[PDB]
mmCIF file of C-alpha atoms in Angstrom:
data_model
loop_
_atom_site.group_PDB
_atom_site.id
_atom_site.type_symbol
_atom_site.label_atom_id
_atom_site.label_comp_id
_atom_site.label_asym_id
_atom_site.label_seq_id
_atom_site.Cartn_x
_atom_site.Cartn_y
_atom_site.Cartn_z
ATOM 1 C CA UNK A 24 19.009 -11.329 8.105
ATOM 2 C CA UNK A 25 17.206 -10.954 4.491
ATOM 3 C CA UNK A 26 13.612 -10.846 3.210
ATOM 4 C CA UNK A 27 12.185 -14.535 1.742
ATOM 5 C CA UNK A 28 11.288 -13.818 -1.724
ATOM 6 C CA UNK A 29 8.113 -15.829 -3.322
ATOM 7 C CA UNK A 30 8.018 -16.850 -6.838
ATOM 8 C CA UNK A 31 4.694 -14.618 -7.502
ATOM 9 C CA UNK A 32 5.513 -10.972 -7.520
ATOM 10 C CA UNK A 33 1.915 -10.579 -7.047
ATOM 11 C CA UNK A 34 1.958 -13.206 -3.948
ATOM 12 C CA UNK A 35 -0.431 -10.332 -1.865
ATOM 13 C CA UNK A 36 -2.758 -9.671 -3.615
ATOM 14 C CA UNK A 37 -6.071 -9.571 -2.659
ATOM 15 C CA UNK A 38 -7.552 -9.569 -6.749
ATOM 16 C CA UNK A 39 -5.566 -12.272 -7.858
ATOM 17 C CA UNK A 40 -6.681 -11.234 -11.432
ATOM 18 C CA UNK A 41 -4.378 -8.298 -11.542
ATOM 19 C CA UNK A 42 -2.071 -8.752 -15.075
ATOM 20 C CA UNK A 43 0.881 -8.287 -14.399
ATOM 21 C CA UNK A 44 1.749 -8.008 -18.565
ATOM 22 C CA UNK A 45 -0.447 -4.872 -17.885
ATOM 23 C CA UNK A 46 2.148 -2.720 -15.926
ATOM 24 C CA UNK A 47 3.545 -0.117 -17.402
ATOM 25 C CA UNK A 48 6.729 0.656 -17.508
ATOM 26 C CA UNK A 49 8.539 -2.352 -16.918
ATOM 27 C CA UNK A 50 8.200 -2.700 -12.731
ATOM 28 C CA UNK A 51 10.703 -2.681 -10.900
ATOM 29 C CA UNK A 52 9.591 -5.112 -7.638
ATOM 30 C CA UNK A 53 10.554 -4.075 -3.834
ATOM 31 C CA UNK A 54 12.586 -6.346 -2.449
ATOM 32 C CA UNK A 55 12.672 -5.700 1.082
ATOM 33 C CA UNK A 56 10.111 -6.226 3.857
ATOM 34 C CA UNK A 57 9.849 -3.894 5.904
ATOM 35 C CA UNK A 58 6.754 -2.553 7.394
ATOM 36 C CA UNK A 59 4.883 -0.806 4.986
ATOM 37 C CA UNK A 60 2.485 2.090 5.669
ATOM 38 C CA UNK A 61 -1.051 3.156 3.819
ATOM 39 C CA UNK A 62 -3.394 6.597 4.608
ATOM 40 C CA UNK A 63 -7.031 5.340 4.253
ATOM 41 C CA UNK A 64 -10.356 6.557 5.549
ATOM 42 C CA UNK A 65 -12.014 3.114 5.474
ATOM 43 C CA UNK A 66 -12.196 1.840 8.903
ATOM 44 C CA UNK A 67 -10.251 -1.228 10.370
ATOM 45 C CA UNK A 68 -14.448 -3.100 10.197
ATOM 46 C CA UNK A 69 -13.544 -3.324 6.527
ATOM 47 C CA UNK A 70 -9.652 -3.836 6.071
ATOM 48 C CA UNK A 71 -8.917 -6.518 8.118
ATOM 49 C CA UNK A 72 -12.273 -8.227 6.695
ATOM 50 C CA UNK A 73 -11.009 -7.881 2.841
ATOM 51 C CA UNK A 74 -7.842 -6.612 3.261
ATOM 52 C CA UNK A 75 -6.926 -3.642 0.798
ATOM 53 C CA UNK A 76 -8.951 -4.253 -2.435
ATOM 54 C CA UNK A 77 -8.137 -1.894 -5.587
ATOM 55 C CA UNK A 78 -10.152 -0.091 -7.813
ATOM 56 C CA UNK A 79 -10.115 -1.059 -10.432
ATOM 57 C CA UNK A 80 -8.346 -4.109 -11.760
ATOM 58 C CA UNK A 81 -9.762 -5.000 -15.234
ATOM 59 C CA UNK A 82 -9.995 -1.694 -16.829
ATOM 60 C CA UNK A 83 -7.673 0.355 -14.603
ATOM 61 C CA UNK A 84 -4.621 2.195 -15.177
ATOM 62 C CA UNK A 85 -2.569 -0.091 -15.421
ATOM 63 C CA UNK A 86 0.928 2.897 -16.887
ATOM 64 C CA UNK A 87 2.191 3.888 -12.829
ATOM 65 C CA UNK A 88 3.262 7.012 -13.838
ATOM 66 C CA UNK A 89 -0.597 8.023 -14.070
ATOM 67 C CA UNK A 90 -1.690 6.340 -11.620
ATOM 68 C CA UNK A 91 0.286 8.262 -9.864
ATOM 69 C CA UNK A 92 -0.320 12.143 -11.154
ATOM 70 C CA UNK A 93 -3.675 11.366 -11.684
ATOM 71 C CA UNK A 94 -5.692 9.445 -9.162
ATOM 72 C CA UNK A 95 -7.757 7.153 -11.660
ATOM 73 C CA UNK A 96 -9.153 4.282 -10.373
ATOM 74 C CA UNK A 97 -6.160 1.967 -10.944
ATOM 75 C CA UNK A 98 -5.053 -2.073 -10.279
ATOM 76 C CA UNK A 99 -2.931 -0.693 -7.698
ATOM 77 C CA UNK A 100 -3.236 0.067 -4.114
ATOM 78 C CA UNK A 101 -0.741 2.711 -2.774
ATOM 79 C CA UNK A 102 0.998 2.208 0.082
ATOM 80 C CA UNK A 103 4.517 4.064 1.618
ATOM 81 C CA UNK A 104 8.302 3.575 3.290
ATOM 82 C CA UNK A 105 7.918 6.086 5.276
ATOM 83 C CA UNK A 106 5.458 6.232 8.609
ATOM 84 C CA UNK A 107 5.475 9.373 9.165
ATOM 85 C CA UNK A 108 3.005 10.051 5.223
ATOM 86 C CA UNK A 109 0.183 10.453 6.520
ATOM 87 C CA UNK A 110 1.142 13.357 8.208
ATOM 88 C CA UNK A 111 0.124 14.850 5.100
ATOM 89 C CA UNK A 112 -3.247 13.160 4.222
ATOM 90 C CA UNK A 113 -4.311 14.670 7.777
ATOM 91 C CA UNK A 114 -7.972 14.340 6.071
ATOM 92 C CA UNK A 115 -7.550 10.145 6.174
ATOM 93 C CA UNK A 116 -8.849 9.253 9.040
ATOM 94 C CA UNK A 117 -6.536 5.810 9.482
ATOM 95 C CA UNK A 118 -2.529 4.822 9.199
ATOM 96 C CA UNK A 119 -2.126 0.930 8.630
ATOM 97 C CA UNK A 120 0.865 -0.744 9.218
ATOM 98 C CA UNK A 121 1.289 -3.567 6.283
ATOM 99 C CA UNK A 122 4.107 -6.339 6.286
ATOM 100 C CA UNK A 123 3.573 -7.752 2.538
ATOM 101 C CA UNK A 124 6.339 -9.433 0.284
ATOM 102 C CA UNK A 125 6.746 -7.781 -3.319
ATOM 103 C CA UNK A 126 5.288 -4.406 -4.729
ATOM 104 C CA UNK A 127 5.823 -2.332 -7.287
ATOM 105 C CA UNK A 128 8.708 0.361 -5.908
ATOM 106 C CA UNK A 129 7.807 3.826 -7.821
ATOM 107 C CA UNK A 130 10.402 5.506 -7.443
ATOM 108 C CA UNK A 131 13.314 2.603 -9.156
ATOM 109 C CA UNK A 132 9.988 2.403 -11.562
ATOM 110 C CA UNK A 133 9.388 5.625 -12.774
ATOM 111 C CA UNK A 134 12.578 7.471 -11.385
ATOM 112 C CA UNK A 135 12.663 9.905 -8.393
ATOM 113 C CA UNK A 136 12.039 13.055 -9.800
ATOM 114 C CA UNK A 137 8.811 13.410 -10.437
ATOM 115 C CA UNK A 138 5.884 15.483 -8.710
ATOM 116 C CA UNK A 139 5.110 13.087 -5.887
ATOM 117 C CA UNK A 140 8.845 11.342 -5.477
ATOM 118 C CA UNK A 141 8.502 12.570 -1.744
ATOM 119 C CA UNK A 142 5.488 9.730 -1.204
ATOM 120 C CA UNK A 143 8.074 7.173 -1.968
ATOM 121 C CA UNK A 144 4.810 4.784 -2.768
ATOM 122 C CA UNK A 145 5.157 1.215 -3.180
ATOM 123 C CA UNK A 146 2.214 0.523 -5.338
ATOM 124 C CA UNK A 147 0.438 -3.180 -4.722
ATOM 125 C CA UNK A 148 -1.247 -4.861 -7.960
ATOM 126 C CA UNK A 149 -3.629 -6.373 -6.584
ATOM 127 C CA UNK A 150 -4.108 -5.153 -3.548
ATOM 128 C CA UNK A 151 -2.988 -6.477 -0.092
ATOM 129 C CA UNK A 152 -4.647 -9.745 1.333
ATOM 130 C CA UNK A 153 -6.013 -9.019 4.998
ATOM 131 C CA UNK A 154 -3.093 -11.167 6.148
ATOM 132 C CA UNK A 155 -0.591 -8.887 5.126
ATOM 133 C CA UNK A 156 -1.986 -6.414 7.814
ATOM 134 C CA UNK A 157 -0.792 -5.248 10.059
ATOM 135 C CA UNK A 158 -3.005 -3.333 12.542
ATOM 136 C CA UNK A 159 -3.655 0.409 11.883
ATOM 137 C CA UNK A 160 -3.065 3.368 14.231
ATOM 138 C CA UNK A 161 -6.403 6.332 14.140
ATOM 139 C CA UNK A 162 -5.021 9.794 13.164
ATOM 140 C CA UNK A 163 -6.005 12.336 15.270
ATOM 141 C CA UNK A 164 -6.656 15.353 12.998
ATOM 142 C CA UNK A 165 -6.333 18.686 14.575
ATOM 143 C CA UNK A 166 -2.012 18.021 15.801
ATOM 144 C CA UNK A 167 -1.633 15.573 12.312
ATOM 145 C CA UNK A 168 -0.707 12.559 15.106
ATOM 146 C CA UNK A 169 -1.812 8.698 16.105
ATOM 147 C CA UNK A 170 -4.125 8.004 18.681
ATOM 148 C CA UNK A 171 -1.460 5.617 19.646
ATOM 149 C CA UNK A 172 -3.630 4.325 22.763
ATOM 150 C CA UNK A 173 -5.858 3.235 20.009
ATOM 151 C CA UNK A 174 -4.289 1.274 17.666
ATOM 152 C CA UNK A 175 -5.718 -2.409 16.841
ATOM 153 C CA UNK A 176 -3.920 -5.188 15.438
ATOM 154 C CA UNK A 177 -5.516 -7.267 12.843
ATOM 155 C CA UNK A 178 -6.553 -10.543 14.001
ATOM 156 C CA UNK A 179 -5.978 -12.028 10.508
ATOM 157 C CA UNK A 180 -2.417 -11.615 10.053
ATOM 158 C CA UNK A 181 0.046 -13.818 9.612
ATOM 159 C CA UNK A 182 3.689 -13.441 10.487
ATOM 160 C CA UNK A 183 5.591 -14.564 7.849
ATOM 161 C CA UNK A 184 9.266 -13.840 8.377
#
């Protein structure tokens, strides 16, 4: 089955003050609805209550290539198509599982030749409300593996397809 499409390209946003017209270059929006992932040090006690909030929606770096290459504060919350990218971010103690519409497909938007194209990123302008955060798995730092008996579902997750 194909995915439902919301009319609002930032329907998912935790911070709706994000300014879609300030995004550069012109974004190529993700139209698939597979699970995405985010390595984050922040704990589920916080993420499940707040969602993923972006560092700066008003004065942050709205330029995608600038944000990818130099992680200045931005209106974006980064995620990945790649379940296993947490192995590269071993320091972050969690691999979050996300089921959210939309997002800017970084490689479709700025190409797949830049330094970080292997990150297969999707950038959420305005972040990601908790209802789109499936859950989380803690990461064992020494083996770069998920502690699967310690995964936790987000009580606020609301399936939508």
